[PDB]
Design a protein around this nucleic acid. Structure first.
Lengths: 115, 148
RNA sequence: GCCAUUUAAAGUGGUACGCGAGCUGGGUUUAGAACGUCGUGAGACAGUUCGGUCCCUAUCUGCCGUGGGCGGAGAACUGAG
RNA sequence: GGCGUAAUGAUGGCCAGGCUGUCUCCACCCGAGACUCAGUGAAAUUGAACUCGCUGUGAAGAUGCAGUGUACCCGCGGCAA
RNA sequence: UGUGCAAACACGAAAGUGGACGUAUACGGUGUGACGCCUGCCCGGUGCCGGAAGGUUAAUGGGGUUGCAAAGCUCUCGAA
RNA sequence: CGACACAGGUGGUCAGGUAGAGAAUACCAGGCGCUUGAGAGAACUCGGGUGAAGGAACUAGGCAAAAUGGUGCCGUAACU
RNA sequence: GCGGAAGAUGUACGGGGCUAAACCAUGCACCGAAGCUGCGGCAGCGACGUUAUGCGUUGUUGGGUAGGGGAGCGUUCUGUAGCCUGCGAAGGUGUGCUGUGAGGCAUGCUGGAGGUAUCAGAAGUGCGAAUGCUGACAUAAGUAACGAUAAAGCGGGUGAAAAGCCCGCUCGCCGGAAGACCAAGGGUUCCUGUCCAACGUUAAUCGGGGCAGGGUGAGUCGACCCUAAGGCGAGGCCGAAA
RNA sequence: UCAAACCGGGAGAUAGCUGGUUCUCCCCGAAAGCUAUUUAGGUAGCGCCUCGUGAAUCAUCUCCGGGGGUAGAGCACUGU
RNA sequence: CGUACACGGUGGAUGCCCUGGCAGUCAAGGCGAUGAAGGACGUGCUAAUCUGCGAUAAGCGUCGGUAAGGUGAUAUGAACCGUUUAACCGGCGAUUUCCGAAUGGGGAACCCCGAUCAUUAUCCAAAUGAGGCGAACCGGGGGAACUGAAACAUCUAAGUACCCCGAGGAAAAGAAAUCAACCGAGAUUCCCCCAGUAGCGGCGAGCGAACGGGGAGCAGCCCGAGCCUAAUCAGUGUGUGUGUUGUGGAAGCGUCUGGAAAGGCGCGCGAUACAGGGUGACAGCCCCGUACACAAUGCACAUGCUGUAGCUCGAUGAGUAGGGCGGGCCGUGGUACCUGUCUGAAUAUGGGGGGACCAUCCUCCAAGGCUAAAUACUCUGACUGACCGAUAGUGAACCAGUACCGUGAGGGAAAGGCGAAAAGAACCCCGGCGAGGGGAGUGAAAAAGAACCUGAAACCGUGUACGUACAAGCAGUGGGAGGCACCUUAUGCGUGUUAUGGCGUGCCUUUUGUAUAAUGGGUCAGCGACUUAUAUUCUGUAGCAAGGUUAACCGGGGAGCCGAAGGGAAACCGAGUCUUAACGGGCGUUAAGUUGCAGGGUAUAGACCCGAAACCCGGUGAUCUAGCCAUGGGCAGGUUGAAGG
């Protein structure tokens, strides 16, 4: 009796339409959805965030690569940046001492000094 | 009442059958509700005193200033409807159409057209007609009949 | 397993006791019947015996062979493995 | 019901003569086709992905687990794991 | 093996009916099942049938007890 | 008739049309071509016709196949 | 540490490879968890204050199948207030924005007739997973199949087309039979003319196909009539009666 | 269609038998014993999830006042 | 060939509409041997269906109404009729072939007659009845099972299903040898209550009244005689309240959009008449219709009246009451009712009854009979419905109970809509071609062309964006590099898509464990699975408060129920009560509940859906086949060759 309405036949859509990176099926069909996207929302339910503290392997494992060229490295390279000056955080840093033959030394001579 | 064995040959089990319509059978539209307590359809956790008590409290809502007003019995006589709109205008309560309307004796037809008017008699007036959207208006004989 | 005539030798074990979408069916677990045993009995008895059906135009994959193209083509050759 | 028994019985087992592929092993041919071409044109059958190989492991013989290596595309025919 | 028949035997709730448009050199109910040789030991334990001292075998009526009635208890007498 | 223009099933009469041992093959009369096509000398069956030598050795069983298999004369056992 | 130790299409610790880039006895610094600590955003329970389960502060802070509890939005119709619309709505497609979400909302195209918000009540209310029910559809396949009455062929005619419509010749099949006459049954399917969209497992100017007409004129043919096994109705007799 | 007809009818027969049972999010988060029940893959009073009410001060991870006698040990019934 | 989209198609969902259903309500209610219902078959110039009739065949006649238009649904061609006023609407009359329950007899519609039973009987069928049909309801008889008792033989389902006979529009019952709180009630049914009490029951499960009270409706009378006339009977006249149709009936207004408004916007109006429909798109004030008015018919239930006709006296029904035996049935208990066999009274100076038997009170008197009124269903007519909407709803809004299936009983679909009108594809080209369309035309809001509104998904074709014949697989995410393509969301800000690299074993139940060689699904949409009375026990909210709430039926009631003091077997007491000479103890007590709507749960009852074989009843069938019977037909011929003579 009650005409289905904007529910069902309105559910096949509003879904399937969001997978800009769909697959063969899992987008053309619905029975392939709500099971392919069910993994979505989860699988990494609230984890992308993994990268941070994950791929961050470098930036703290390249800092020595930046150094070990104009003196010591990692060991007493970060144990000097917090000694003098305002002490700059290590984010954009330890990532710039690779894509530019400059600034990387603007931290080595900073360190090794006032040690 | 069960049907027992007989009638038409075919393996079938005990199932609610009312006018060839299934009921009281949990696994069928309008069937037994195993999880009892709430034998009906979605209402609200809720009367003997709220329904009736209100049926009384409402009758008291009339004796309030910012409310309705009692009209003489001659009101039921008015055959036309325009006369009502007038008696409601001069009454300074033409905005009562924005409310509703009632009376006594028989159903006052001559007002069943006026804005918001669910005609009803003082005899059987559930809290409903008593005040459409917490507001109303009645007549003389009506009040007396409602008193009891 | 009785056994016969030969054989210089004429071992053994696994492959879901390899192998029935390859075969054969002769055997066992159907409708008849015969027999013993059990039963009063129908009938019964992983007791026996005579007669008794075992299917499919493989799509994919694998392998055995044969070709078309791709690295511009005809002809003649070489050739790791 | 025991014993035994002419003629007959598409009944069960067995031996001889003659003969025969039934077998030890097997060539082609004939009719109607298969392979290709015009026209006419269904029905069965599929969770997804899918070209693996060598070892190891696993209920100790899985392509799909683990470690490496490797893997050109398509198509025709078969015997079919 | 049963039966001379309004029989045995069988069918139907009943009314009626099959076998009888028959009748025992009949018909119904069964075993064996040909032909040939045949054919020996026991009835202690079923079914059917016949006879049968004694034992077993209801209720009514009858007798005794019980109770100014009645329950109840009990005796006696018993076809096929 | 069988769901269909399904090689299934379905009564009677014509059994002297011509050649032989006959209502058997070939052939007048009569009827019909209404049981999808075209090209190439594979592997690959079902149907089919038998093989040099041996010959059932196959096999549950010679299943299958084959063989004797017209007519006339001679001759013909056990058993009953 | 070793002898006691033979078997399966190419053999090695994950590999390279390492006298330690092994192993054994220890130790230190790092990478490395959604771990621990720090910055911006929670839940449940309990405590304090409170009418409050509203806030503020405080202790514990946050994995989960079966199962328990709770919130939620899509939805229809009928209240009361109050609006939008052919300077165009609902619905549909694509897209932007917002909410933890369930969703709301906007734009463009289209549609082109009505459709909502607040508070309130309501409904047979919101759904991918019964060898589920019904209809439709894809891949599979343009793959499988057409076989004792195995006969057609060479010219010609007609036609816009003719390998199977028609003519001639030649070549064959059947003969108790595909011949002739009939029962049952089927039933006009018979004949003529005009056509073919539909039927004929190809095509067809052909048809037992489609359409329109015509055809089956008996006293002696058959029906009609009667009867056999047998059956029925009426009277007679049985709770009652078909 | 028969170790038992077909159709419809009194069946949406009865089953301690199988399967089935579809929207989002948040919090917490098992067990496999006893008595009785036509009861044992079922409930009720109870061992265990959750919610409301009621009462009231321990409990136990500790300590303190009792009961058991197993491992082990020693050496011990009995029988070697 | 992967994926997205674009244009077109397939398909048909969806949105809207719907001349249909479903449900409720009021009114009304039988037909026929003067041969009906139903069916068969005719009939219109053409008509194949449906409907109407029926051979004066979708028609004839009269009266009344009505009206110019008409000749059914199909708006076609031809053509007719009407003012000698038709069509149409209502009533009535005439006619009404043959067959047909027909019954003379036979018979699958065809041929010849009152057949059969029965009454009266001038016994001549001469005069009459029965023999059929019809939705349910009603009365009198016969009478299960599965099932429940989670076994089952009582019991339960049942006195139901089904069967036999019969009446009416209504039946059955009934005037008390009753009831039995009483110096009382007092015909019988039905509704409510009394009771879920008394009672019954392996007293297990379950089963289950009545008296009375409150209502609806009220009516009492007849069988021997005497006498005389208003009960009754026979007959006559003959209604008030009506049925259908037509008459007295107001009303396009303005602007804008459009082909057209029943649009938007502005204004006004009807209402003892605030249903709905139609008219070119949502008009209560356009048309019909709704309240209303009038005339044609049927019914006329009743009453009036004529002739009959009061009234009076006595009595009152034996194989019955009752008893015994064997059963059925009931709530029926030794104390219901009825059937069958046997036995068998008295008699009102008598007898029966008051739920046990027998003597003593009260009531009432059988063994004869009749009797109005008070509810049912729903074919038919009308109305309504917060019902459904054409895979919805009745199977049927389209030929439907039709297509079609089965020997038969029986079973049983699908198919809606162009629009203002008509269009529904003219003309031209191509081609073998009325079977493949460019083009073009049709259009409104037909993002229209013969199953035509809108018109999605699965899906197909072309085309576009982008990968793509070394390529490893959930096919993401974050970081950093590449290019290409687009700048209707200008801002170092994004998309389509992709090369390469680091990771990554569909979804759903069963199970201790399932990604798993456990089970289910090819995909899609729709469909598809937790309710209607009451009773009991708790919980959340709220009014009021030892008072509270009613039920039938009335805005009135308070019956009755629960609570207020309890406890006990009871008597009985009372601060309870059991135990108890007595005493002493056990348990309970100084004020809150009741009445609904909801939320936990519980019992009686089709109370989890679908899913396997049985059982029982009434019917349909042996053109298959099995056996028998009746009537016909068939068996080239050969071989061997007895008895007998």
């Amino acid at each position: 009796r009650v005409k289905r309405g904007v529910i069902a036949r309105a559910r096949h859509k509003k879904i399937l339409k969001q997978a800009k990176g769909y697959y063969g099926a899992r987008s053309r069909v619905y029975r392939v959805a709500f099971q392919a996207v069910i993994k979505a929302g989860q699988y990494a339910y609230r984890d992308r965030r993994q990268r941070k503290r994950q791929f961050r392997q470098l930036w703290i494992a390249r800092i020595n690569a930046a150094a070990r060229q104009n003196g010591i490295s990692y060991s007493k390279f970060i144990n000097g940046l917090k000694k003098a000056s305002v002490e700059i955080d290590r984010k954009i840093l330890a990532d710039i001492a690779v894509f530019d033959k400059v600034a990387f030394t603007a931290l080595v001579e900073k360190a090794k000094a006032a040690l | 009442e069960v049907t027992g064995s007989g009638k038409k040959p075919w393996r079938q089990k005990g199932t609610g059958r009312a006018r060839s319509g299934s009921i009281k059978s949990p696994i069928w539209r309008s069937g037994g509700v195993t999880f009892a307590a709430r034998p009906q359809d979605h209402s609200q956790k809720v009367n003997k005193k709220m329904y009736r008590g209100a049926l009384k409290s409402i009758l008291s809502e009339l004796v309030r200033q910012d409310r309705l007003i009692v009209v003489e019995k001659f009101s039921v006589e008015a055959p036309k409807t325009k006369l009502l709109a007038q008696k409601l205008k001069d009454m300074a309560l033409e905005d009562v159409l924005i409310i509703t309307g009632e009376l006594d004796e028989n159903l006052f037809l001559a007002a069943r057209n006026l804005h918001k008017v669910d005609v009803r008699d003082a005899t059987g007036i559930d809290p409903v007609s008593l005040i459409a959207f917490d507001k109303v208006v009645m007549t003389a004989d009506a009040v007396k009949q409602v008193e009891e």
